[PDB]
Amino acid sequence: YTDGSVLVSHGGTEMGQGLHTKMVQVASKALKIPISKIYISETSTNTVPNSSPTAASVSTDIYGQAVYEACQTILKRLEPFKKKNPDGSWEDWVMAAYQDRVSLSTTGFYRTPNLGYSFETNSGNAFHYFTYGVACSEVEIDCLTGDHKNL
Amino acid sequence: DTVGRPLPHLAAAMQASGEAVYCDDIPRYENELFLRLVTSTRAHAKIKSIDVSEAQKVPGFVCFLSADDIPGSNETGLFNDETVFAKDTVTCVGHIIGAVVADTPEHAERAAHVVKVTYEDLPAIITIEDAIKNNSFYGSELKIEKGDLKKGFSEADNVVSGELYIGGQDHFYLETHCTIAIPKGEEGEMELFVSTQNAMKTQSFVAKMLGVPVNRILVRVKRMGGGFGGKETRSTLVSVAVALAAYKTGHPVRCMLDRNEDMLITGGRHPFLARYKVGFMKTGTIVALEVDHYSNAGNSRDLSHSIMERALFHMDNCYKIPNIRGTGRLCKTNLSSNTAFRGFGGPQALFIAENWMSEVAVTCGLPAEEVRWKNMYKEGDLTHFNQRLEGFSVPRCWDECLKSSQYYARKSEVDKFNKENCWKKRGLCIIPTKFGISFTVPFLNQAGALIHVYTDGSVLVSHGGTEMGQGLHTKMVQVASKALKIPISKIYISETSTNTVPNSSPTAASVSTDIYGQAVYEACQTILKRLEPFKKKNPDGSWEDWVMAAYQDRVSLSTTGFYRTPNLGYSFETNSGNAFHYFTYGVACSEVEIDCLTGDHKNLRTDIVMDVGSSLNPAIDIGQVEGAFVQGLGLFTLEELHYSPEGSLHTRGPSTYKIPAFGSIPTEFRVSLLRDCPNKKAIYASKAVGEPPLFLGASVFFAIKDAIRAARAQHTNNNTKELFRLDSPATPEKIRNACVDKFTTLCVTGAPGNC
Amino acid sequence: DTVGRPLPHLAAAMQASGEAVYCDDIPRYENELFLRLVTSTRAHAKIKSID
Amino acid sequence: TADELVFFVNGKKVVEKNADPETTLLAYLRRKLGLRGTKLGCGEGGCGACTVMLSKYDRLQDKIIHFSANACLAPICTLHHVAVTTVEGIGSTKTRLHPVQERIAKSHGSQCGFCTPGIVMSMYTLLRNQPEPTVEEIEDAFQGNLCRCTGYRPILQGFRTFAK
Amino acid sequence: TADELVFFVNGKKVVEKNADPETTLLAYLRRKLGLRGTKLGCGEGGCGACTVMLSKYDRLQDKIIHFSANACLAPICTLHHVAVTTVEGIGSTKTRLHPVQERIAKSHGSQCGFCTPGIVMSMYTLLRNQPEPTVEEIEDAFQGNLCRCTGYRPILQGFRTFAK
Amino acid sequence: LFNPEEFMPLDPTQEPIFPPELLRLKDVPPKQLRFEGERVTWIQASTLKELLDLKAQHPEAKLVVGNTEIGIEMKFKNQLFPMIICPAWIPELNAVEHGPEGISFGAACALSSVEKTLLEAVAKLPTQKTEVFRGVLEQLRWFAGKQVKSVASLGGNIITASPISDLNPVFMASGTKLTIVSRGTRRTVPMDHTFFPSYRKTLLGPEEILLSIEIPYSREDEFFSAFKQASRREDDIAKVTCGMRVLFQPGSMQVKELALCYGGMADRTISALKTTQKQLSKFWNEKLLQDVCAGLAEELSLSPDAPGGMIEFRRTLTLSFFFKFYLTVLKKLG
Ligand SMILES: Cc1cc2nc3c(=O)[nH]c(=O)nc-3n(C[C@H](O)[C@H](O)[C@H](O)COP(=O)(O)OP(=O)(O)OC[C@H]3O[C@@H](n4cnc5c(N)ncnc54)[C@H](O)[C@@H]3O)c2cc1C
Ligand SMILES: Nc1nc2c(c(=O)[nH]1)N[C@H]1C(S)=C(S)[C@@H](COP(=O)(O)O)O[C@H]1N2
Ligand code: MOS
Ligand code: MOS
Ligand code: FES
Ligand code: FES
Ligand code: FES
Ligand code: FES
């Protein structure tokens, strides 16, 4: 918007996992502006259509990419104004862009490459990569009651 | 492909059934409160106290809000020269001091009336002459000048100088100003439902008052029950107040203005005073023109500068004038700030032009059509601001209107009528117009759209424009359908919102179809390019097939579109650069009968020919011509605002302010759109239609003046070349008074008189 | 640039204060109604009547 | 010790046990009954945006009568045993439009749409009194209805089809 | 024929003139008073999402007592002359957070946030009885609060700072 | 632009039914009703007797029929009337009675009923008997809309006593008879200059109510016109409107009676008494035209600062309207 504040919308929903937090961190990094200038309000079908469910643990990966791309478009469009006013502020560059009738709205989109596993041929990538981990747990059982303590 | 077909307004059936939802029709939240503005009763005064003691005793009273309650900024208005809430000094009757909040609109009303304000009066400036006398202006003189005036006036055979006034106008949108504000309680978030043509400024202004980033504020506009410019900026008077109430209470709050509040507070069309001098030949040819314009701007700048700019751009009307100088000054007065109204300074300057042109024809003793024609621009001429007239269609409109209206035969019938009638007279006049298309501020000439295609193949279009009855959404659906090659039944537009298309210009300047049409078209082109590979693979498949395949191939079915009108940028320093993209043209012939004894009149017949290029929708465009013409008929002949000498508006409702009624329209009322005139410069060869036809209403005014001339020939004197001043609006008062006879002079009593 | 830093969840302060709005926390319209599902008490049956 | 106020709106009985004398029919329809087709345009009788039809059995004429009225000035307390018909009472897009509604929409007689319900009810009321009106009766039916958008021509043209 | 029910919520007097015996404090807070910080998680006393603090003067003990309760099971009709404190009664981002609120937020003890008000009210109550509790007392305060997101570690870690 | 051949035909029998439940309730005998609000008690009177008693008991109680004036007063002029009586149900206040001298209308009769009745009278009766009726109809021509006329009462307009009432000048000029009642009292008076003593006031007692209004048949040698200004710029002042009557000695053009009454020339409806008195026994000619115009110019002269402005226009109308009457009477005299 013309005050330099940024509204980000993406196909992902917040359920406690901190997806919007991460998307704001990404946008802040990509645009090179403080997180306080960016806001995510909600997820809605009239801003981003045809969204996949927020699922498969990939929301950061895929919406992170879409947000990044949209940010890159914004930066490209602002670049001439940065050059004209190199000692100026984000707010001054945005206002100059607006007054020069440069669009400050853009979509971003990402499509995970090289996926296509076939049950017929047992080939083609099913996953983009894997997440790994190891855990070691110790317990004490009460053999008389079936209760236990996680130590 | 419905482009060029007379498709009814998409919402017309719902509007007829009362199902169409306007702002106040939105259901109320269980805890929703109501706001009523508290407003100055003095033109200019210091505020000495505000007593809410009696208001607090009204059942359901919640709070009184004033400048002290604002968390962010009390500085607002387009040029930051207004208060949200007046603090120490009021500067017009209707100036907003504060607001009451209550549990019902009846209780808010009751409480507001009982709020008591104490004032100390200050010297006030009400009239343009007050303002000139006191040097009370906003900014410095505006000017356009071409040629050599001293030379032109030296070559002139005749010179006529004079003064003319044109009264203002109340928008009288059937739906008054309305806002609902819903505070979310999180992070300063607020969602507003507003009857506004300017969601962007609403959003910004609410944000500034609250002191929160613009991204926290969402403004949504489904539709307006009329706008006419009166909701281009002045809607923020209500919106910002209601947002404050929401912020303060934490409850949803709404306000819809009563008619009397709306007429007082929200501003109207600028009254203009003109002082003019024209030099001309005995043939009627104009060789020199000087016009000083003064607008009554009221108590803030608002859009007054750009309105005066448009006035200066239109002081030529359709006439080539080699030596010309127009100036404009904005009068700073203790009246509600005047604003945009359909035409935006154009009708005023065009009326001033036609007035001196009427006097040229009278002075020369030549038929008015002939003087107009002889002075008309030709294809490819430059205007006084040095813009080339390309596709100048006025000559075609003129010829066709002369023929279809049967002007010459009817002129002879009017003369026969005036010969046979002593106390009634007819008049007939034919008038051209041109109207420049684009915001005169270059950066407002930008437009965005956002289109989504859902997986069932249905399409949701969003664009920066708002619907106020002009059929903009209708035209955008027709455009999108043609562009995508799918039926209109597959496309929907729901509303205008700041979170779908940001930084939108106000829906104004008649350019919305033009600029949102291009933005929508471009978005549609992007969708088509992305679907092309799927059509290639399945050329006999359906739209739905193509869309689903694209979805399943992970091709995005959502895109923005954007348009920026090219080659715009007039300089007042070089008197060069295009102020406009193109011009819309039209001609109207009107006939009237006046009652010389009473000042009443009948509109007998009107014929209009309008150049709208290749119309996207003839039914909608004919509707715009008719509605705009009737508003102009109101401006010039019916509608009159009246103030006490202390500057308080007397005319605050339909009982004292008379907009045209069913019975007001010309008995025979014909409109034609010019044929085979595509416009290369706009979407699918169409032209802007919103504002250009309104000045054609003046054809009635100049027919009335023709009829008065005949009455004066009958009863007043023998001077066939007499110039008398007739100000606008030509109400029964002005008409009657101008028919000088044995009654106006009291000669009938036996006294001598000027009869 | 906060990427890689332990920034608290953006809404956490409002979640702790009870200001974060979840679906049922949205205010009710004056005319707003309430729905309750009627569900089978049998694993597999013909529906014979509903009274 | 207040009597109940009993009237009808669109064929349905309304029993108001706590009528405030100050309550206008327009306020009641919009803000109590939630029928928002009827609009506020001025609150002083000039504009017709709030036009409804009233029907009662006139005990002095021994006759059912139907007339138009401005909802904005009609006190509900005058309406005991009166029937109110609003725009939603005569047709809708969810059921079937009344011929009056169809013709004003199709004739391009609705632009912004705000005056349309009031005009529809003025025309409706005429047809309920006179099923075969003349062209003149039709024009006179609208002296109390203002439209700022259309210039009136299309509304009259579409309604002229009811004449003879 | 029916008595008035008088209690206090966040310092403000509530006078219920027509108390229904079936009405729960949770329903009253949310749907009559519009204080939606207190949540429904189960309606059976097991999750503590609806946790509030109640205060009263004990006549027998001769002092003001403070304890936690499940609003989902507290009939409002038990609350005559009792003071209720909810999450909105102790701090706000619009004014100032209570230390309990600040610490759970900054310690990463809130993910979805739905259990957070109840846990805040459990910890707040403890602190109102014991300004300097032990690590043991802190964990015990939460036997009645469930969280599905966090795995509890950060919540205990953040509140440990209040000991001993 | 559209195709009417495709429109749904109208089916007059398929209209919403008049609520049968409501129809059943019409048998129930009317009785007084009482409504109580935050600020106002409203009594719906079922009988004239009830009305007169209520008014005797509460003389300050405000009558409301159509509310087209009281609604404006309450909403816009801040007025509050703590007790209202609505007499609309009372048969006597709704009666339309044909008598020897004229047509009587109960005071609650809506202007639409008056217009219907008079239009019927004018179609049936000799032109010479319906001069005043046609005056009334001319004033009702472009007067509000159908909505207002269907509920605005005849008595409401009269007692409102606006300086710009279009009806009061006609009723004054014709000496229309007003039957006025309270508990005990009953009196009939022709309306004349004295009926309106001051701004918005009438010559009624605090308890009195206007029962009926009798609009006279015109007589032989009697002629009537009414005219009105076609602009209004202020709430209730400075809109010229008039009723004009002349009675001639039998078969002559010699003035026996003359009445010129004007609204919009003062803070009440007024009669140009001094001017008209001077024309008694004079003949209907140019000299009378000149003398009346001179009389009107003087008697009705407006100060430069008169409320409502339009000073020259209004003077001119008073004269121009008389001129139109003068010529119309000449045409009627043959
Ligand atoms: C939009 C509109 C346009 C109008 N145009 C015109 C116009 O062009 N010319 C014109 O002359 N008028 C005009 N009027 C005024 C209209 O004619 C009057 O307002 C109407 O006749 C008043 O009648 P009512 O029944 O509505 O009165 P109410 O508002 O109910 O009462 C009016 C007054 O009369 C008193 N009253 C009523 N009945 C009696 C009774 N029988 N006995 C004693 N007192 C009584 C009441 O106490 C009150 O003081 C217009 C009004 C509207 C709203
Ligand atoms: N029905 C209707 N038509 C209308 C208006 C309106 O408010 N209602 N506003 C006019 C004005 S002032 C303008 S500038 C244009 C704006 O819309 P456009 O750019 O889509 O023509 O519509 C014109 N026609
Ligand atoms: O993919 Mo998570 O919603 S199971
Ligand atoms: O540009 Mo129209 O809103 S005056
Ligand atoms: S709202 Fe305008 S007449 Fe009722
Ligand atoms: S359609 Fe807009 S007022 Fe009539
Ligand atoms: S809702 Fe789970 S304990 Fe109350
Ligand atoms: S943060 Fe989600 S249940 Fe606790």
Side-chain angles (χ1 to χ4, degrees), chain A residues 1 6 39 45-46 101 112, chain B residues 189 215 452 454 498 554 565:
Chain A
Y1 296 101
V6 181
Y39 191 71
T45 61
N46 72 341
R101 297 180 278 156
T112 305
Chain B
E189 284 201 47
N215 64 12
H452 311 311
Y454 295 101
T498 56
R554 294 181 282 159
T565 312

Side-chain angles (χ1 to χ4, degrees), chain F residues 62-70 143 153 157 160 165-166 210:
Chain F
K62 245 291 180 303
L63 296 202
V64 173
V65 177
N67 197 57
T68 67
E69 170 68 33
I70 289 308
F143 177 116
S153 70
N157 189 105
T160 288
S165 164
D166 289 296
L210 176 60

Side-chain angles (χ1 to χ4, degrees), chain D residues 8-9 28 37 63 101 105 112 148 151:
Chain D
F8 283 75
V9 178
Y28 202 91
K63 180 67 180 170
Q101 293 169 323
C112 88
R148 190 56 149 169

Side-chain angles (χ1 to χ4, degrees), chain F residues 85-275:
Chain F
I85 303 161
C86 179
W89 280 1
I90 300 170
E92 281 88 344
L93 287 153
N94 286 273
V96 175
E97 308 173 331
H98 285 258
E101 306 307 281
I103 304 163
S104 182
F105 290 96
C109 290
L111 295 178
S112 64
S113 295
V114 176
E115 178 156 37
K116 178 177 170 157
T117 296
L118 262 23
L119 278 170
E120 292 187 311
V122 170
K124 157 185 190 172
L125 300 177
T127 302
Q128 195 48 57
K129 291 175 177 264
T130 66
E131 289 277 314
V132 180
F133 302 159
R134 279 175 280 123
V136 182
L137 293 169
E138 282 297 314
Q139 295 301 78
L140 291 175
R141 184 158 185 189
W142 287 101
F143 177 116
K146 304 289 176 155
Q147 301 95 322
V148 169
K149 281 203 264 174
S150 297
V151 305
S153 70
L154 182 62
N157 189 105
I158 292 162
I159 301 308
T160 288
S162 168
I164 64 166
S165 164
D166 289 296
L167 307 183
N168 283 330
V170 172
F171 300 148
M172 189 183 287
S174 59
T176 283
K177 299 198 180 206
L178 304 184
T179 300
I180 301 147
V181 173
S182 77
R183 170 156 78 190
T185 71
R186 172 151 176 151
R187 64 195 184 87
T188 307
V189 298
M191 188 191 283
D192 66 12
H193 66 271
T194 76
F195 189 70
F196 306 106
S198 62
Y199 179 63
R200 293 310 195 86
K201 271 198 137 190
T202 54
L203 210 53
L204 303 208
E207 301 195 18
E208 283 187 316
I209 72 90
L210 176 60
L211 179 60
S212 58
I213 298 105
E214 188 192 56
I215 307 173
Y217 292 117
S218 45
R219 302 163 280 195
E220 281 296 305
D221 309 291
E222 190 163 44
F223 307 100
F224 200 92
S225 294
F227 307 98
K228 59 188 181 177
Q229 189 184 301
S231 68
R232 170 173 165 191
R233 130 213 281 208
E234 279 186 62
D235 291 337
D236 73 333
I237 59 165
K239 201 261 275 197
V240 187
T241 182
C242 62
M244 294 183 180
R245 206 194 106 237
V246 65
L247 175 75
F248 293 117
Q249 299 293 336
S252 67
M253 303 170 77
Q254 173 174 19
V255 173
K256 173 171 187 174
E257 281 184 345
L258 183 71
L260 307 171
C261 303
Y262 291 89
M265 292 305 285
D267 65 357
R268 69 205 183 212
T269 311
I270 56 164
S271 192
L273 282 166
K274 297 182 289 137
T275 303

Side-chain angles (χ1 to χ4, degrees), chain A residues 15, chain E residues 109-116 119 146-150 155:
Chain A
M15 53 189 110
Chain E
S110 188
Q111 278 188 36
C112 86
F114 212 70
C115 69
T116 318
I119 289 173
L146 299 168
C147 174
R148 191 51 144 174
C149 310
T150 61
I155 302 183

Side-chain angles (χ1 to χ4, degrees), chain A residues 119-146:
Chain A
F119 276 90
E120 301 181 313
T121 71
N122 198 25
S123 59
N125 299 323
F127 308 113
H128 193 45
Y129 59 95
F130 301 78
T131 289
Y132 304 104
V134 169
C136 178
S137 294
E138 164 167 28
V139 304
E140 185 168 293
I141 70 172
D142 188 316
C143 310
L144 286 171
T145 65

Side-chain angles (χ1 to χ4, degrees), chain B residues 6 59 107 109-110 113 258 260 423 595 597-598 600 619 622 640 642 650-651 655-656 732-733 736-737 743-744 746 748-750, chain F residues 1 38-39 75-76 78 142 230-235 286 289-290 293-294 297 308 310 312-313 315-317 319-321 323-324:
Chain B
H107 290 333
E109 187 182 38
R110 276 200 208 138
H113 279 67
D258 268 327
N260 70 323
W423 299 108
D595 185 324
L597 284 169
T598 64
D600 210 347
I622 293 173
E640 169 185 35
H642 179 50
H650 281 314
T651 52
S655 65
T656 54
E733 183 195 17
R736 184 61 190 92
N737 287 359
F743 308 97
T744 66
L746 302 180
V748 70
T749 73
Chain F
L1 291 205
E38 269 163 7
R39 311 197 296 174
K75 186 167 174 66
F76 298 100
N78 213 188
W142 287 101
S231 68
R232 170 173 165 191
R233 130 213 281 208
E234 279 186 62
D235 291 337
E286 297 300 300
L289 178 53
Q290 170 169 126
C293 287
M310 296 183 162
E312 174 167 320
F313 180 49
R315 178 187 83 204
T316 290
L317 288 187
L319 306 203
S320 301
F321 287 159
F323 180 60
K324 284 201 175 199

